[PDB]
Amino acid sequence: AVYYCILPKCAAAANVAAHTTHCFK
Ligand SMILES: [Zn+2]
């Protein structure tokens, strides 16, 4: 998910469905 995202500027709207694409949790 996004909660386990260690990136400051990953998602624009804090979206996960679009973030997970690059982030492997
Ligand atoms: Zn991320």
What this model shows, in words?
This protein has one domain (1-25). Helices cover 0% and strands 0% of the residues. The protein has no helix or strand. The radius of gyration is 7 Å and the shape is globular. Bound molecules: zinc ion.
Summed up, what is this model?
Helices cover 0% and strands 0% of the residues. The protein has one domain. Zinc ion binds next to loops.
Helix percent band: under 10%
State Rg: 7 Å
Separate helix tally: 0
Q: How many β strands by DSSP?
A: 0
User: What oligomeric assembly is this protein in?
Assistant: monomer
Total domain modules? 1
* Small-molecule binders: zinc ion
Biggest β-sheet: count, sense, barrel? none
Q: Which structural class do the helices and strands define?
A: little secondary structure
Distance N to C terminus:
6 Å
- How much β-strand is present in the residues? under 5%
Principal-axes shape call: globular
PDB class: transferase
Keywords: zinc finger, protein design, transferase
Assembly: monomeric
Entry title: Solution structure of Designed Functional Finger 5 (DFF5): Designed mutant based on non-native CHANCE domain
List the helices and strands and how they pair.
Blueprint (H helix, E strand, L loop, with lengths): L25
Zinc ion binds next to loops.
Summary tags:
binds zinc ion; 25 residues; 0% helix; transferase; monomeric; CREB Binding Protein; protein design; little secondary structure; zinc finger
